[PDB]
Every structure is written in structure tokens, then in C-alpha cells.
Swiss-Prot record, chains A, B:
Keywords: Calcium, Capsid protein, Host-virus interaction, Inhibition of host innate immune response by virus, RNA-binding, Suppressor of RNA silencing, T=3 icosahedral capsid protein, Viral immunoevasion, Virion. Belongs to the icosahedral plant coat protein family. It is found in: Virion. GO terms for molecular function: RNA binding; structural molecule activity. A motif (GW motif) lies at residues 222-223. InterPro entries: Capsid_prot_S-dom_vir, Viral_coat. This is Capsid protein. Homodimer. Homomultimer. Interacts (via GW motifs) with Arabidopsis thaliana AGO1 and AGO4; these interactions inhibit RNA silencing ability of host AGOs. Interacts with host TIP. Capsid protein self-assembles to form an icosahedral capsid with a T=3 symmetry, about 32-35 nm in diameter, and consisting of 180 capsid proteins. Also acts as a suppressor of RNA-mediated gene silencing known as post-transcriptional gene silencing (PTGS), a mechanism of plant viral defense that limits the accumulation of viral RNAs. May suppress other innate immunity by binding to host TIP protein, thereby preventing it to migrate in the nucleus where it could trigger an antiviral response.
């Protein structure tokens, strides 16, 4: 018989969660799977404008799922049934500010610029960093292909999750909380098993799962190589057809290691990449134009 | 009401089989899977002594299974429940001779030398090449680890299948028949997903699934590189620490392709290998001693 | 629109004597010269299609002493390389295989969606339905060169009438392609000349070429069962008129040697 | 044989301020100085063991304003590298994690097999049971340097009596190892000298060395909380007697510089 009209504020709250057992079952068309995953942690921000982190929802996405990749390699089509996102805090009540989660149906779209247009997305949620909240995504009934090669994201992907936080104090906690996913997936058509590696060249051709991305921003060339995961096993090898000024430089990353030379006309390099944070790149190769060659990237 | 005391011989027989649906279900400890696979085809032999083909039964074996590799990467222990082998013919009644199948419990053992000791193995079967027969392997209750790295085959493997044929005519069919497997597998302990590549060096260290093998037979060195599968995606890359006389030669294989040079002190090569028959090797590197370096092999 | 049922023949299978298997692929779209022979004329006046029935049949023509096996399979992704080994081929759902002196039937389930019928640059995941793979691997030396035939039974629906598409192929040497896809042009060396890859089977393929300048040689036959040229080429202004009968895909029957980028016009017509 | 139940302390956790997580591993075998402190004396007189109960407990000692998370997990393969990212860590079955001002209990099921208790060259898949991983990733700057403690509750069975194993470690500079695994010797450069990696925690570690010839310098302290050498080294024949107190694993407390391969003898004793 506590007082309803009066509320109290504690120093901190503790949430306890243990490991859950995934469920796999068979049916007439294919298999159904139920499980849970962890995405990432959140950091503080001392400005008055938000900073965004994004995640694309596809079954063949190494940056989002970890154990669904092995069972998604035997099939071609998918359909989601249930999708929930959960936030878990790690900070006391002295921390002030807000955190926000939103979901959009267009995968190929930049994040919004200001705070006013962020609140115009349907179904957005926001809270204080010392409490938990749940976002539930409704689903439709449409079968889509799995992501391989290069295609329009409007044809194969389901949507994208956006996470943001803007306003904290000068002396505050370094990390805020973590985000988990509960999913239910259906699979349709069996096929032979496929390889897990990314092979491509510099003329916009990709023939594998989405692991890395390339950008030009050409001032005396200079090619950027952005990674999308944290799997710490990234091995990259590159073949040169003509003379290159420099290759295999460390732009901004935790560690770098290269073996062979690059000053030959026909030469193969080999590098190992350690990644600690999302979007960090460990390659910067300058040329005089867009060159001819072949690159291969592999996890573990 | 046919005549029991009289038998007839036809020109040929036809067996028809369609694709079967595998069954996956969950339990308290882990998952159970039921399915079927194809191994290989058989060829003729005009001698009077048999020629043998062998297959090691482990869940993490790329040369034996094709779709069990993806689901065996999430677990650590296994136990078999049912194992059957089936032979299917492709030849008329003009073909004369015998084909034989046997199973042994010691994985690290050479095949027998003569026909008399081949018939001493318990449970061996033999027939004419224009009929079908079934071999059933009884199973025990012992949990074993999956095969990764380098270990004693007496500790991790279950057994090995031996297939043979010896005596055919001069003018005869080129191919005889095919062999299929029906299995039932149980899995126990969940773990994080592992990489599918083989990384090693020349001082007897292997850190992945069994894809290739190396042999010395040192006369002015000369390193052999035998493949165990037919997956046609084999990419091999090798780093040299000192000067090598020659590298990346084609010994006996269908196709070969190499990109970079090998006459440098620090150099990386890159080769693609096409394999049509088991045991064919596409590498032959001569040195003056056992060298220091690093090699990586990857399927697809 | 209209509904039509029918049965058509694709191709005949051949003996394979080497160790590795041989695969042939067929893409199922109504605007395909390599799959259909009579549906392509009614499909040229419409924009959308839907399949309601689909089946495949194998008919033997080999003697009873011929040993081996033939295989048929169907898949959903029209943009995918063919498999390498037999174990990945037998993992596709619904695969069938049999000895070459008997017949069998493959049945494919269908859905209810409307797709565009067109030829162009667009994604095969958007406009195509699937792909058929036929595999032959193991035969001997003293066997017949022909094994059997493959036929298709279908039922289709068409939706929206439009203006008709022309049936002949018009082009020139600097690459411009329009009309039906009947033939491909390839080059290896500018001094050597060009190859004329007919990627369809038929009789009475009429090809005519125009030379705007002098040419060293023209009208060379390479892999044609029959060849007949009636108009010669000489100096600045001349025309040619050639009739080609083709038996198998990609023969490369016509060879002409000129300079790097000559000027002219070529017309290709079927029957 | 005998049956024993008990509770022992392993180690204390520390604050982690950088971006990447920190992992510590512990191998569960009765002949391990880095895991047990009293079971190693009764395990030196037997040959086989079996576990019937196993549990782990975390006890906090940090204030309520300390933010972060601690994690514990157990796995079955004793020969495996630690994971890189957090997502592969949370995929291990039975993992637990909590805020550092509260406690939690991890429970591990057991089986019924007999394994050898020994230290040597043999396979960890044959003689070991499993491995424990403790992870700490996210803390701040104005937080306490100590977080908590980990304890083990167990019940074990021993089978076959044998002769007793000696408790001190005897060795020399050319690599020969026998006795309990208490300390490791490492070298980087022959001119620079050797590093003395004490891979266990304790007090009163007594080390004595013999020099068969002249030495440039000896007895240098690098990362010891306390150091005391009472016997000097001079010319051909001298001995040393050093007492080292060690707080954390792998400090590398003793440094001696000599030539490439000197002759001598070293004895290491705990308490």
C-alpha cells in the first residue's frame, strides 16, 4: 500500500539478464528460427546536436547478426515475423540527457540534420539514460531476396535502425548503455552453400556479402576503405597492374600489419587489420587515376 | 505366380530417386539433423588387383559433407545415431567384375595390399557392377570433439570408408556407379561462429579445417600440395622469407593461374586452382631446405 | 488479355566423354529466342505476364546398351553462375536424374505476381522467373552421339496491349543494338576481324552486310553446316546476301576482316 | 580415495578505461598454481580426478556510483584463443553479466569421466576440463581501481595414490624445466639479458641463483612491489638470495645481464 501520489528517485538501477536458448523448427516450406542478438554500446556527447549510428536489417549482414549468417547461407528468400529492440542502461541518476531510437523503411537515405525533423519519424522513442525502454516494429508479408553482389537497396532490404544521443555534461559517464534485438525469421528455398569472402575490383563490381566499402573523394586520388564490423580477423590482399606511388598506409585504426612490397608493376600485397570502433579504415592508396586490379577481403 | 525355380537376366536395370527433405529439430541439449549426401563416382580397372578410395567420417570434413559444414560450425561435440551407404549402378549386364565396400574404425591406417586381407574386415560387402546393395554401420554412444587444428585421429574421428574395384574387361563402360550416404547427427554445445579458411606454415602447424595436405619426399626439396575436394574455388597464397629457385608450378591438374612473381626475398604469390579428380595437386615448389613462410588456402 | 497453353521443344542433348560434367542453362522469360519459338510473337504485343502451370519432360532416343545418367534442375535466381561439382548440383531442391533410356517429368510450383516482359539493361531479379540447368557427365566412346529431347508445357496470361516490336535485327560495327536478340558480334584483334556468334538454333538465317569502303576479305565460313553467299563485295559500294543454317549454339559462322572501325550496316533475320 | 569440498579465491578485478574490453582466462585442472592454492598439495599424491560440483561467485567492493558491467563465461575447449568482440562473447552458452555493485552466481553442469592430473606436453583435450573467461570493458576516469573478487566452490574425487612430487622449481639457463610451473624465463637479446615472468600471485617468493663466472650486473628490480637481495655476486664463485613479493601476473621482476649462454643454477620456491 505505497503512496501513489508520491514518487522517489534512487541512486541507480540494476537489470539482470542471462543467456536465452534459440528455437529452430521445420515446416512444409522451410525453417523458422527465433533468437536474440546484441548490436553495440553508446557513448556520451557534449554538444547540443545529435550523433547517429545506423544499422541495416538484412539476414546476410555481418555487421548486424552473428549466428544467423551460417543458416542464411543455405537459402535464398526470407520473411520477418517479429522484431523488437531493447535498451539497457549502465549509468546512475546523476547523468542528465536523452537517448533516442527510430526505424525507417528506406535503407538508402541519409540521417536527418536537426532535432526537429528527427521527431517527425513515426514511432520514434526517447528517454533518459538511466532507464530502459522497448521499440516494437510491425511487419508485413512480402518475400525478398538475400543480399549478395550489388543491387538496389529498395529491392532487397527491409529497413534501417537509427540510434542517437545529444546532450550530456562535462563530467559524466563515458558509456551509456547497450542495445539488443529479438527476432523471428522464416526461410523458404534451399540451395547449395556459398562462399564467405568479398572479391572485387575498382570499377564498381562486388561479388559477395557486404563487409567493406570504398570511397574516392579524389584529390590526387587517395582511396578510402571503410569497415562495417568489429570481427578483428580482417585480411585484405590487393593486386596492382601498374606502378603505384604508395600503398598500405594506416589512416586511422588500432593496428596495422603489411607483409610484401608495392612498388612493382605486378605485385601482390597482404595486410591484417584490427578494428575497435565502427567505420574505422586502415587503408589509403594514392594513384593518378582509377586503376585496374583486384582486391579480396576475408573475415578471420 | 511366376516360376521360382527359374530365373532370368535382363539387359539393364533402372533405379529412380528424387530429392529428399532433410529434417532439423531441437531438444534440451542441442539439435538433431537427418539428411543424405553423395560422395563420388567409380571408374573401371583392367588389372587383377584392387584400387582404393577412402573417406574419413567427421562432421567438419569438406571432402565428405557439403551442407553439414555450415551447421557444424556453431557446435563443439557430436554423436552419430544412424549411418547407411548405398550404391547405384550405371552399366548393363555385359560388364563383368565386382565392386566392394568396407568400413574400418581406425582413421590413421593404410589400405590393405592384397585381395585376401581385404575380405578379412568385418562387415565387408561385394557385388557385380549392375546391381545395388546397402551397407549399414552400427554406432556407439561416445561424444567426440569436432576436427580443427592438428590432433590425433584416434581421438576425434569415428572411422573411414574404403571403396574398391579390381577386374574388368578391355572394352567396357568407363564409369560404374555412385555412392550415397544417409546419416543422423546430434549436436551438443553452442559456441561462437568460426572462420572457414586454412592458415599454416611449413613447420607442421595447421589452424583450420582439413582442406589440403603437404608432403616433402625431399630430393633437392620439392613440396607437394594435395587437395582433398572438388569444390573448384581453391585460392592459395604463399609468402616467401628468403630466395626461392622456382614456385607456383603445375604438377598434374586441370588448370592453373598465378599472378605475382616469386624471385624476390620478400614476396607474396596468389594462385587459383581447378580440381577435377581427387588427390590432384597444382603446386610444386623447390627450395634448398625446409623454409620459413606462411600459406593460406580458401575455398570459393 | 489472352490465355494460351502449348508445348514446345528446346534442344537435344549430346554425348559427353571427358571426366568433367557439362551444363546447359535456359532462362524462362517470354521474350527469349533461345527458349520459345512461337510465344515470342504474341509476347511482342504485350507488357506483363504471369505463369500458372510449368512442367518439363525428357524423351529418350538412345539404345538400351548406353550407360550414363542425365540430370535436370530448376532454380529461382536468374543471375547466378552454374555450379562446379556434382554435390552442389544435387543439393538444389527438386533435382531429378535418370538413366538415358527412360523418361521423367519435372514439376515446378508457381506464384501469383506480375512482371514486365522486356529485353534490356534492367535487373534479372526484377523481370525473370528462374533458370533451368541440364547436366550430362558420364558416357563412353562406343555410344550414340544423341541422347534425348527436352520439352516444356506451360499456361500463361498476358495483360496490356501495346505497339508491336520489329522482328529483324539492325545494327552497325560501332556497337549499337536494337530489336530482338538473335546474334552477337565479338572481336579479338582489329587486324584479324570479327566473330558472328549465333546464339540460337534454326534454319534459313539471312544476313546482309554493307561495306562503305574496300575490304580485304569477307564471307568466310568457319563452323556452318551449310553456307551460301550470292552477292560479292568489291571496292567502295557493294552489298552481300548470305544464308546460314545453324545446328548448335555459338558456332561463329561468319568471319570478315577489315580495319579497326569500318563503316557499314548489317541486318539479321530468322527464316 | 578421498573426497573434498572447499572454497578458494582466485583474483581481483581492475578498472578498464580504454575502448577495447579486457579478458582474463583460467584453466581448471587440479595441478594449476594459478587457480588453486590448497588443492595442489593433495593433487600431487594422486593420478586421477573427477568433479561432481562446480560454481562461481562474484562479490562486489565498489561504490554505488561506479558505472559499467562485468561478465563471466565458461567453455569446454581448453585450447582455444580468446574472443575478439563482445558479440562472439555473448553467444557462448550460459554467459552472465551484471553491474559491478551486485553479485551473481554461475553454475556449470558436470559429467562422469576420469582424466589424468599432470603437467607436461600432452593434449589439453585429453587432460583438462574447461576454461573460465572474465571480461571487463567500460569504466570511467573517476572510478575506483578495484571492482570485485571471484571464488570457486567445488567437490572432487581422487583415485590412485603414488609417490609425491617435489614442491620447489629447479632449473638452469639452458632450458630444462621440471617440478611445478611457478615461473617462466624469457630472453630478448643476449646482451640485454633475461626476464623473470612470475605467472602467479603470492608473497615471499624466494629465488636463489648461482653464477659460475663473472657477471656485469644482477639483481635489478623492474616491477616488484617489494624487493630484497641479501647476498652479493662477485667474480667466479658467488650466490644470491632474493625475496620477491608479487601483486599481479607477469610482472617480470628480476633482470640479470650476462653473455649468451652462461652456466649456473636457479631455485624458485613459494613462501
Amino acid at each position: 500500500v505505497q503512496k501513489v501520489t508520491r514518487l522517489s528517485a534512487p541512486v541507480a538501477l540494476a537489470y539482470r539478464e542471462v543467456s536465452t536458448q534459440p528455437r529452430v523448427s521445420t515446416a512444409r516450406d522451410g525453417i523458422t528460427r527465433s533468437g536474440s542478438e546484441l548490436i553495440t554500446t553508446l557513448k556520451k556527447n557534449t554538444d547540443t546536436e545529435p550523433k547517429y549510428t545506423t544499422a541495416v536489417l538484412n539476414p546476410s549482414e555481418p555487421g548486424t547478426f552473428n549466428q544467423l549468417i551460417k543458416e542464411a547461407a543455405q537459402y535464398e528468400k526470407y520473411r520477418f515475423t517479429s522484431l523488437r529492440f531493447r535498451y539497457s542502461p549502465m549509468s546512475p541518476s546523476t547523468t542528465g540527457g536523452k537517448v533516442a531510437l527510430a526505424f525507417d523503411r528506406d535503407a538508402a537515405k541519409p540521417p536527418p540534420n536537426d532535432l526537429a525533423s528527427l521527431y517527425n519519424i513515426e514511432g520514434c522513442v526517447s528517454s533518459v539514460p538511466w532507464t530502459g525502454f522497448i521499440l516494437t516494429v510491425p511487419t508485413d508479408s512480402t518475400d525478398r531476396f538475400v543480399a549478395d553482389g550489388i543491387s538496389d537497396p529498395k529491392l532487397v532490404d527491409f529497413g534501417k535502425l537509427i540510434m542517437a544521443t545529444y546532450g550530456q555534461g562535462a563530467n559524466d559517464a563515458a558509456q551509456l548503455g547497450e542495445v539488443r534485438v529479438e527476432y523471428t525469421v522464416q526461410l523458404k528455398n534451399r540451395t547449395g552453400s556459398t562462399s564467405d569472402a568479398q572479391i572485387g575490383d575498382f570499377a564498381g563490381v562486388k561479388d559477395g556479402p557486404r563487409l567493406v566499402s570504398w570511397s574516392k573523394t579524389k584529390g590526387t586520388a587517395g582511396w578510402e576503405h571503410d569497415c562495417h564490423f568489429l570481427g578483428t580477423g580482417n585480411f585484405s590482399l590487393t593486386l596492382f597492374y601498374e606502378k603505384a606511388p604508395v600503398s598500405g598506409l594506416e589512416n586511422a585504426d588500432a593496428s596495422d600489419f603489411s607483409v610484401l612490397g608495392e612498388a612493382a608493376a605486378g605485385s601482390v600485397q597482404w595486410a591484417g587489420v584490427k578494428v575497435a570502433e565502427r567505420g574505422q579504415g586502415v587503408k589509403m592508396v594514392t594513384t593518378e587515376e582509377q586503376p585496374k586490379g583486384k582486391w579480396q577481403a576475408l573475415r578471420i
